[PDB]
């Protein structure tokens, strides 16, 4: 935790994969299985 | 403010918040109460 | 441009100001005048 | 490598560049050629 910018790149890593998580099921809309 | 990238950061994380709440409400459309 | 992380600043701030500016389009479709 | 930065820099870009691959094929549907 030396360098300051690291919770900023955490913190887009965590809203990044977020993001695509609720893309992929918005796009897929059913679960389909 | 030592840091300038500071000012990079603060503005991603605003435009953020604002990103995920437009978002909200429009995948919601109806308030629903 | 001493710091090198200015050109992922000026990245993302055109890439911004472009989703936002193509999202707005989407969500309004028609122009409407 | 020498800025740790960098690899938050790459990491974006390459989503970035995927975000809208993706949006275009999303927004565009048909291929239509």
Same mark, same amino acid.
């Given at each position: ?7 900023? !790149?955490?913190? !887009? ?21």
């Amino acid at each position: 935790m030396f360098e300051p910018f690291q919770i900023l !790149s955490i913190c !887009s890593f965590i809203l990044s994969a977020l993001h695509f998580m609720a893309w992929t099921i918005g796009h897929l809309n059913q679960i389909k299985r």
